[PDB]
Amino acid sequence: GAFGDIQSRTVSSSDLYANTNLVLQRPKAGAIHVPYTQAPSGFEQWKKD
Amino acid sequence: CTVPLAPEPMITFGFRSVSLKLHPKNPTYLITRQLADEPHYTHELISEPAVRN
Amino acid sequence: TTMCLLANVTFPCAQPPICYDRKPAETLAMLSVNVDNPGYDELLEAAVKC
Amino acid sequence: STEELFNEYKLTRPYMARCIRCAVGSCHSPIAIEAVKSDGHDGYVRLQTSSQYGLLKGRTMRYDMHGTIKEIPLHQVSLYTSRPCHIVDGHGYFLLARCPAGDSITMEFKKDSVRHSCSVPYEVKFNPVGRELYTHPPEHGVEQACQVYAHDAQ
């Protein structure tokens, strides 16, 4: 939820650090999907600040 | 009815203290109260990222 | 048991003598008088259909 | 079993009433609106109009037009509060839509070259469930109890 929740060492580094508070939830009865909950993007919140 | 589910708060513990980092997707009530004879409740609508100690 | 009215006739409410497909205005005037009634739904459902 | 429920609106007729905002000005409308009841949660409103729905015939509107009762299919009738709504079903004088919030409600259909409309200043409102104030209902989450308009005409 803050700046640098995604950290890639260079622009094409192919190794990124992700700490985004991703949590998986239980799907609805009779539905094939992957539900999840996570804190919103901190680069957008940093652009808002 | 299906209702949404807010992100997990990030709880930091201290001596007789609880801090809470709260990143909401859409506006969300935080309702706290103490389990004593004076509850001192707190009904607040948090819409932005906010730290509550 | 509840008896409805059309005239001085306490007919069974589940079996009215008239139906809407054969009498257009007489059944409406039949339902006109039994409005204040616990047994109006039965007379209603039996009054449109036969 | 649906026809014994339905048969009571055979006793009735549509009528022409007064709408203050027609397609041009104030006129006498075939589809004038009596009330818009939106007290359930997820955006379902319940219109009561000057027209009838379902007369048996599946998805049709029945309306008075200067004396001569006419009909059109129900996919020809559109309505919108702020965004476009979605009609679910109709039964007699009543309609079950799914509208977002907005400060008016406008129903309109279109004949071959004549457009009919009725706008009334009635607040249509949206109601979330629980302690998160969404504007559109989500894709997933914990199940919760609510109170919505029933789809059937029971």
Add this chain to the structure above:
Amino acid sequence: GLKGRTMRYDMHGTIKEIPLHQVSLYTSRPCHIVDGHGYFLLARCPAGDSITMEFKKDSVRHSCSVPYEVKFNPVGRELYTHPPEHGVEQACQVYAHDAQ
């Protein structure tokens, strides 16, 4: 208006026409054209930031959006967005429907 209710537009030098009930415009919610005379259209609109007048002659959609504010101005000391079904009549000033 040039014929009862039609609009007359240039198209690459040559002049065409369509009936007016296929022209639609909207500010934030849809509008309703009342009449038109010469270059000037009269409409009835809610408030918004812009206006998009559009029609569709062939399977080719014409549009134009300009960023001009449309505002809704109530009469009296009571501020509404859509005029009421009933009330009292006050002196107001609206654009006259005729063309004199």
